[PDB]
């Protein structure tokens, strides 16, 4: 999982 | 009592009860959200208000950013979600851009640093383009790549006067990666009735689970995916029946309910097939945020900055989030679980407590 | 967030 905000 | 930890419990309950409000606005589209992001961004916004408007946010957020012994336990907060002993990564910044001409409250620079750790980075919004790229450019280089465009044109002018951002990013590899071979088209089914085919992975192996039923009845599964750092994971829900619409869990979604899935699980063999997704959403605060009552701040003649500056009147212009997520197979008899219907997923730093991520896929 | 005068 990649995730950014 | 464990005050990082104490802090992360209410800033994941705010943050969980804005999600709430953006799920309900947007019932059936796609939508990617970070608790901590916009717990992280009111923070900020706590220390450059004063009188009623401060009041507001500090009464939805159930807590003041200035009590004596915020400073360490939030220190220590960021300390605890940035460490190495997580294995997976995860990066987060506060930054202020404001107007260089502004005149500022005497001791809000460093009391600022003091709480968020960041230096104040003064702008000159009257060279809007100037100024919008050095935003974005920030974001870009903090967000890895991810998030290159975070303010649209138009989103700031020569009348902005300041900006605050989160940069939150998170990396992380699954404990047991999905056997690319177990990949292939599966149909998933909307809730408007209709039918589309994606890509969903397999895997069969002992996960933790726990079985919650909504106060009017209806069951619904709750998985845990752990990271392999084993201090980060990703929830999966969604309702056993297929009638049962997603609507039905967000309505009851809260960061206490989503540690009492935790508590209550138990490792069982299951097969389970997740479609992999890759979303990107934006989401606007404003009616989110006057909902949970904070109006005065968004108001022209209501608004009260002057814990920032005394020089003139501010207002909330604008207040948005920008969310990416992917999720694949790898990173950088049991019984079955298909999601393939809309579900909800969580992911949280579980020694903290802390909700990073949320969100609701309605269509892969 | 974006703050204005
Ligand atoms: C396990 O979860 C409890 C809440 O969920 C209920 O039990 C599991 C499912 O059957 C679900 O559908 C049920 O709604 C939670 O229970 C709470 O416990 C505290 C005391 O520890 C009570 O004060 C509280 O009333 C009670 N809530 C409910 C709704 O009964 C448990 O704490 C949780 N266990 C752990 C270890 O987290
Ligand atoms: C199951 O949960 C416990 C904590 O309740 C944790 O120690 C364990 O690593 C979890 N197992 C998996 C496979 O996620």
């Known amino acids: 999982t990649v995730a950014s905000s | ?364």
Chains 1, 3 share one sequence.
């Open chain 2, 1 to 364: 009592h464990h005050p990082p930890s104490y802090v992360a419990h209410l800033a994941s309950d705010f943050g969980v009860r804005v999600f709430q409000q953006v799920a309900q606005a947007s019932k059936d589209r796609n939508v990617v959200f970070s608790p901590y992001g916009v717990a992280s961004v009111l923070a900020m916004l706590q220390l450059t208000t004063g009188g009623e408007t401060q009041q507001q946010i500090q009464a939805a957020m159930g807590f003041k950013i200035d009590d004596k012994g915020m400073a360490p336990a939030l220190r220590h907060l960021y300390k605890e979600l940035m460490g190495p002993w997580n294995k997976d990564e995860i990066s987060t910044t506060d930054a202020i851009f404001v107007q260089r001409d502004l005149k500022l409250v005497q001791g809000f620079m460093p009391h600022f640093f003091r709480l968020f750790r960041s230096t104040v980075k003064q702008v000159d919004f009257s060279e809007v383009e100037r100024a919008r790229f050095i935003i974005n450019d920030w974001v870009k280089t903090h967000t890895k790549g991810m998030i290159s465009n975070l303010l649209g044109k138009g989103a700031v002018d020569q009348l902005t006067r300041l900006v605050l951002v989160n940069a939150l990013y998170f990396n992380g590899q699954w404990k047991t990666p999905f056997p690319d071979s177990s990949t292939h088209r599966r149909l998933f089914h909307k809730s408007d009735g209709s039918t589309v085919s994606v890509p969903m992975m397999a895997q069969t192996n002992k996960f933790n689970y726990t079985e919650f039923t909504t106060p009017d009845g209806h069951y619904y599964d709750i998985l845990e995916l752990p990271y392999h750092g084993d201090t980060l994971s990703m929830f999966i829900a969604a309702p056993y029946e297929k009638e049962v619409p997603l609507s039905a869990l967000t309505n009851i979604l809260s960061a206490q309910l989503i540690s009492h899935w935790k508590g209550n699980m138990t490792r069982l063999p299951r097969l389970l097939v997740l479609p992999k997704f890759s979303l990107e959403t934006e989401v606007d605060l404003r009616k989110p945020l006057e909902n949970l009552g904070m109006t005065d701040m968004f108001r022209q003649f209501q608004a009260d900055f002057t814990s920032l500056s005394d020089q003139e009147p501010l207002h909330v212009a604008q207040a948005l989030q920008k969310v990416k997520i992917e999720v694949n197979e790898s990173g950088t008899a049991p019984e079955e679980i298909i999601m393939d219907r809309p579900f909800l997923f969580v992911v949280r730093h579980n020694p903290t407590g802390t909700v990073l991520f949320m969100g609701q896929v309605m269509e892969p």
